[PDB]
Amino acid sequence: HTTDTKVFDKVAASIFDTVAKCGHEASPSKTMMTPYSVEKTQTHAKQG
Amino acid sequence: YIAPNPRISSITLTQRITTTGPFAILTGSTPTAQQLNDVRKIYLALMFPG
Amino acid sequence: NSKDVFYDKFRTEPNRYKALFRSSFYNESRRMNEEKILEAVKYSQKLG
Amino acid sequence: TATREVDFTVPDVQKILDDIKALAAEQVYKIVKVPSISFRHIVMQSRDRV
């Protein structure tokens, strides 16, 4: 519901902070957060 | 030359439901060179009455 | 997750998310991969 | 041929709702300790009038 950069950065930081405190490790290099591209189970989709 | 607003013929309600006009096939068509010349003839005849 | 899709045609549309991509998160995501490519190149050059 | 012109015939209602929600948080008043100065005095060589 927003396009402001500082809100999105805080949201991503909250996600990573939570998963870090949860005990596991989440790599910010592989984690994906995109509007238009969707991947699951070695299946990829771009723009329909 | 200015075309009419596209929102007149069709209106959208949700992401998957839209209304259809009665002349969709004619609206989607495009003129050729000779048809454009005929349109120019129409406007030239309109702008000089008699 | 509906499986009853059907396809109409192609279209081009403006992108609402264009301004968001100046974020720090995307910059670090790119920079991780630049480090990953460059260290692999250095290792390959050093071994050979 | 189909994708040659950019389309604007579908308004983004979600964008409008987000814009109104963002505008709802705008602030108008300010809370201050001291009101802004409205009167000032120019001094000259006189010791009785300004």
For residue D3, give the nearest of C12, C14, C16 by CB distance: C12
User: Which residues, at least 6 apart from D50, have a Cβ–Cβ distance to it below 8 Å?
Assistant: D41, D42, D43, D44
HSE-CB for A29 with a 13 A CA cutoff: 7
Which technique was used to obtain these atomic coordinates? cryo-EM
**By the 8 A CB rule, do A12 and A4 touch?**
no
Residue C43's contacts (CB-CB under 8 Å, 6 or more residues apart) are none
CB-based contacts of A12, cutoff 8 Å, min separation 6 = A33, C23, C25
D36 to D31, D39, D41: CA distances (angstroms) = 12, 9, 15
Residue A2 touches partner C, C-beta closer than 8 Å? no
- Is the minimum CB–CB distance between D10 and chain B shorter than 8 Å? yes
Q: Which of D1, D7, D16 to probe the C interface (max C CBs under 10 A)?
A: D7
Contact flag D2-C13 (C-beta cutoff 8 Å):
no
Question: Resolution, rounded to a tenth of an Å?
Answer: 3.3
